[PDB]
C-alpha cells in the first residue's frame, strides 16, 4: 500500500552511499548512514507488521463482481 | 634501524580490525581508525623516501678484506 517501496528505496540508496564511501574512506558519515539505515529497517519492519496484521484482520471473500469482471 | 619494523606493524593491525568493525556495526571507534590509518600511510611513504635519498648517492664498492672470506 505504497508504504514499503519508499523505505526499501531509501535503504537501498543508503547502502549504495555507504558502499561508495567505503572505497573513499569516509567513516565520519558512515556511522550516521548506518544509524539511518537501522532506523529505516526498524520502521520497515513495523510497517510490514502492522500491514500484515491489518490484512489478516479482514477476510477476502469472493463476490460475484470478481467473476463478472 | 627499528624504523619501519614498527610503523608497518601498526598499519597491519589497523586495517584488519577496521574491516571487522564494519560488519559488527561498531563505527564509534572505526572513525578514529580511518584517520589513524591514513596518517600512518603518509608517514610510511615519507620515511621510505628519505631513506633512499640519503643512500642512493653513495656507492658501495668492493673491498679486498672480504674477498678472501
Amino acid at each position: 500500500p505504497n508504504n514499503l517501496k519508499e523505505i526499501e528505496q531509501e535503504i537501498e540508496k543508503v547502502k549504495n552511499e555507504k558502499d561508495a564511501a567505503v572505497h573513499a574512506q569516509e567513516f565520519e558519515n558512515a556511522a550516521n548512514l548506518r544509524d539511518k539505515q537501522t532506523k529505516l529497517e526498524k520502521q520497515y519492519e513495523e510497517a510490514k507488521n502492522e500491514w500484515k496484521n491489518a490484512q489478516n484482520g479482514m477476510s477476502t471473500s469472493l463476490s460475484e463482481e470478481d467473476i463478472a469482471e
Side-chain angles (χ1 to χ4, degrees), chain A:
Chain A
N2 197 20
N3 298 331
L4 307 182
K5 312 186 191 66
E6 48 180 358
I7 311 180
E8 178 269 350
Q9 293 177 358
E10 290 176 351
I11 293 176
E12 172 67 24
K13 68 173 59 62
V14 166
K15 179 178 300 301
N16 296 330
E17 180 68 23
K18 183 176 60 180
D19 296 329
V22 161
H23 303 288
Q25 301 181 4
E26 297 292 337
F27 286 169
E28 296 180 358
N29 309 272
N32 303 272
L33 292 179
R34 179 173 302 271
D35 294 355
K36 183 177 181 180
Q37 180 180 358
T38 303
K39 185 177 182 179
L40 292 178
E41 290 177 0
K42 180 64 62 180
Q43 293 179 359
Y44 165 79
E45 292 293 336
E46 295 176 359
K48 179 181 59 59
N49 290 15
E50 65 181 0
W51 163 82
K52 67 179 299 300
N53 292 332
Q55 184 180 9
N56 292 17
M58 59 180 300
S59 59
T60 55
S61 61
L62 276 178
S63 61
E64 73 286 333
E65 298 183 2
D66 308 326
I67 289 89
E69 292 174 1

